[PDB]
Design a protein around this nucleic acid. Structure first.
Ligand SMILES: [Mg+2]
Ligand SMILES: [Zn+2]
Ligand SMILES: [Zn+2]
Lengths: 214, 48, 119, 45, 49, 88, 49, 30, 48, 102
DNA sequence: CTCGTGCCTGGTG
RNA sequence: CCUGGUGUCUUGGGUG
DNA sequence: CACCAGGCACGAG
């Protein structure tokens, strides 16, 4: 069980040092290289680990027994401030520094990239690998008007019409499922694959237009 | 002359009282709550 | 030559080996003010064309960089940028051609120079 | 449409906006406009 | 090759001697617009300290 | 649009030399597309309201980026009258 | 602005109270203000600009 | 009417002008 | 109100916001980040 | 750089394709596999870069259940989980799989 | 037909 | 057939 | 306003 791995007084201390914002991974890699190079020599870097969290910007936690080891690990680092801005972390605040932390079929999410950035889409199905998911959304097409797209020069949102595109100029697949312009539209809603890192699920506030439509 | 007619009586300022604004008075004189720092959300006109 | 050499060091342990990536700066080469358009063609630039089209009367500078690898188990000219050129100087296009060609380039002979052209 | 004058070979050519600013003889990228069709008068004072 | 050229152009156009992000505590007015009103004005501006 | 006149412009958006220009007169016509026909906003450069003259030269070329680059040189005659300053 | 119109006249800097004076408008040609040659002492002005 | 020789605009009666057209200067009959 | 912090237009189309608007946006972002600390794991110094 | 879904080490894709996993190739067989198996076993989205220096007397290596491996870069939260067939094969081989995604 | 790579653009400090 | 809109901050030289 | 990461279109096997 994890409860049997709680830190006691025998575990080495953990010191938090302020580093340059955006170079925490570089500092961790440099400390790892220094520890690997000083391993086996007469002057070994008496450190146990060095890590950082994305939610803690500009902070590096190094586990050791004394402060001289931390000073030696931070010696020569260009991404660390020259001041003695290091603090001690209590034993009760050790597991909280190593905390790791949804997406369900039918929930409403918002897109954070592409042309449909900022629209409320519906999660239909997810791939078997677990990386990208299918989103049903309101299309933003022009039915081939200025053809011989960016997020700032996108047209208005409207349901896909299977009859207007034929008059303006289309592959009928299934009942209401049409493949137009390389994109699939079912019942006037575009079904597109989107990555997991490009979508948001937590803290979603629907606007007035989404309440009036959906 | 340039201002439209109003039913409120026209007077002059005779005393200027200074002081601090209480949180209750601030919430009373307010008309909306600001929570989102994003000036533009959908980038399609109409302020949010 | 004030700061001519840049030396690096990275101990690798996976058999330790020190690999120094030394970079030395060499001679500095200067060219005539060359104007390059968007099509890729390069021609001779003149102060009149720089003042008409709001261009910068400058010349490119090249620096020789020599790279060396020092492994202890215990070559081409690089364009660094452009430097503005003073008018009626030793590196300007109005110094040669005597004074006959000065009238064809829309340059007044009374212009003593001594200034830069920026935009 | 609109008469132009080259700045090097002095060639009188006409371009219709969509054409790039260039000379059709020496390739000079510096051209100027021509004199207007209206009559210019002066009071001689 | 853009850093040196941009710095030179900025220092010669705006006159701020130093980096772009460090406009404060810098000597301003090193590069000035050449007065081309007459010959004497240009001759006096070329020899000015 | 500006309150000035637009009849002094040709079909290329530029004014030909030899036409007398006065205050609040468009000489260089330029528009900018409005992001989402009349979907364009005016961005012309009129003459100064206290300057009247005659267009002398019009230069048209390309800049370093590759777009158009226009310049209009207006000439005028200043005659000494009551109020001009002189010096020995 | 016709004749016999009292208008205020000033010149920077305004040291004493005599710097702001009410004068009667007289329509005159050209584009220069015509003043009397006796009010030049309180105005501390001349005709050099 | 803003004239071409001086730099000023003048008011002029209608019977004191001549408008141009396709052949010469046509008066009020244009 | 926005009358105290007006918005000026640079090159016609693109407009620039006032410094007070950016200051208020940064203040609101900091206030939002403050609320995102009393709910999850916070090691004291991060809150401070 | 990708993060292993079983042990949790952080190594580039070419390392997992050539030599495989230095702590999981004995049961995952990432050396004699294609790119699909490596992508299903190693995730490119991870958070929490930890530099494991000690592999026994370190509390960080014990809390992350990596106190019996090799030193290097490890991830705290590895996005994604192992497929059903791979989990069944690991259970048949005698290795219990624990999700590191939180 | 599919993968590697240079170029353009939006996010963030 | 009325109504009507082009700007904030600096740098160097001049005027009284 | 300047740096970094993601999406798009071109070239080669
Ligand atoms: Mg005086
Ligand atoms: Zn020519
Ligand atoms: Zn592994």
């Amino acid at each position: 069980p994890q409860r049997l791995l709680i830190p006691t007084v025998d575990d080495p201390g953990i010191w938090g040092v302020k580093v340059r914002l955006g170079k925490e991974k570089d500092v961790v890699r440099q400390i790892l290289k220094k520890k690997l190079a000083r391993e086996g020599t007469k002057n070994p870097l008496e450190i146990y680990s060095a890590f950082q969290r994305d939610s803690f910007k500009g902070h590096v936690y190094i586990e050791a027994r004394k402060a001289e080891a931390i000073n030696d690990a931070l010696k020569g680092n260009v991404n660390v401030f020259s001041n003695n801005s290091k603090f001690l972390v209590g034993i009760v605040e050790y597991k909280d520094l190593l905390r790791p932390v949804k997406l369900t079929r039918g929930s409403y999410v918002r897109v954070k990239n592409g042309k449909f950035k900022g629209d409320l889409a519906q999660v239909d199905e997810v791939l078997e690998n677990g990386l990208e998911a299918r989103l049903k959304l309101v299309p933003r097409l022009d039915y081939g008007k200025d053809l011989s797209y960016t997020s700032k020069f996108r047209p208005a949102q409207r349901l896909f019409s299977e009859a207007e595109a034929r008059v303006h100029e289309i592959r009928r697949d299934r009942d209401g499922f049409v493949t137009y312009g390389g994109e699939e539209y079912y019942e006037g809603f575009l079904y597109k694959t989107f990555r997991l890192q490009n979508l948001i699920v937590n803290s979603i506030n629907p606007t007035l237009n989404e309440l009036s439509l959906f | 002359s340039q201002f439209p007619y109003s039913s409120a009586p026209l007077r002059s300022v005779k005393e200027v009282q200074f002081g601090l604004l209480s949180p209750e008075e601030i919430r009373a004189i307010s008309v909306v709550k600001i929570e989102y720092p994003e000036i533009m959300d959908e980038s399609r006109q109409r302020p949010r | 030559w004030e700061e001519p050499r840049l030396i690096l060091d990275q101990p690798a342990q996976h058999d330790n080996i020190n690999k120094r990536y030394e970079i030395r700066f060499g001679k500095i080469y200067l060219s005539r003010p060359t104007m390059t358009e968007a099509d890729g063609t390069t021609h001779a630039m003149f102060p009149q064309e720089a003042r008409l089209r709001n261009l910068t009367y400058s010349s490119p500078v090249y620096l020789d960089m020599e790279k060396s690898m020092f492994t202890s188990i215990d070559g081409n000219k690089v364009h660094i940028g452009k430097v503005p050129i003073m008018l009626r100087s030793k590196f300007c296009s109005l110094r040669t051609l005597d004074e006959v060609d000065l009238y064809k380039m829309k340059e007044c002979p009374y212009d003593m120079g001594g200034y830069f052209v920026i935009n | 449409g609109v008469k132009y004058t080259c700045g090097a070979c002095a060639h009188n050519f006409s371009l219709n906006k969509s054409d790039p600013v260039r000379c059709k003889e020496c390739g000079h990228r510096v051209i100027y406009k021509a004199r207007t069709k209206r009559m210019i008068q002066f009071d001689a004072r | 090759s853009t850093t040196i050229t941009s710095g030179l152009k900025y220092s010669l156009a705006t006159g701020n001697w130093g980096e772009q992000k460090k406009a404060m505590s810098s000597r301003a007015g090193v590069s000035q617009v050449l007065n081309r009103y007459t010959y004497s004005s240009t001759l006096s501006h070329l020899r000015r300290t | 649009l500006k309150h000035g006149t637009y009849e002094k412009l040709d079909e290329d958006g530029l004014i030909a030399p030899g036409v007398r220009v006065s205050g609040d007169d468009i000489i260089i016509g330029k528009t900018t597309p409005i992001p989402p026909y009349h979907t364009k906003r005016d961005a012309s450069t009129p003459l100064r309201s206290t300057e009247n003259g005659i267009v002398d030269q019009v230069l048209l070329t390309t800049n370093q980026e590759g777009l158009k680059f226009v310049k209009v040189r207006m000439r005028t005659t200043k005659v000494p009258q009551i109020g001009d300053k002189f010096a020995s | 602005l016709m004749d016999d119109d009292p208008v205020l006249f000033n010149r920077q800097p305004s040291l004493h109270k005599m710097s702001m004076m009410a004068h009667r408008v007289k329509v005159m040609p050209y584009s220069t203000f015509r003043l009397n040659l006796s009010v030049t002492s309180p105005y501390n002005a001349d005709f050099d600009g | 009417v803003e004239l071409h020789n001086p730099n000023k605009t003048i008011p002029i009666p209608c019977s004191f002008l001549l408008i141009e057209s396709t052949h010469g200067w046509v008066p009020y009959e244009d | 109100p926005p009358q105290v912090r007006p918005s000026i237009a640079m090159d016609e189309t693109t407009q620039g916001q006032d410094d007070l608007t950016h200051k208020l946006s940064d203040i609101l972002k900091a206030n939002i980040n403050v609320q995102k600390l009393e709910m999850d794991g916070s090691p004291q110094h991060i809150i401070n | 750089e990708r993060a292993c879904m079983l042990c949790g080490i952080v190594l580039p894709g070419r390392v997992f394709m050539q030599n495989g996993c230095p702590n999981c190739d004995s049961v995952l067989n990432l050396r004699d596999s294609d790119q699909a198996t490596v992508n299903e076993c190693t995730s490119s989205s991870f958070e929490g870069l930890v530099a494991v220096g000690d592999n026994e007397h370190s509390w960080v290596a014990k809390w992350l259940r990596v106190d019996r491996f090799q030193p290097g870069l490890y991830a705290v939260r590895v996005d994604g989980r192992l497929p059903s067939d791979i989990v069944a094969a690991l259970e048949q081989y005698g290795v219990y799989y624990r999700p590191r995604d939180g």
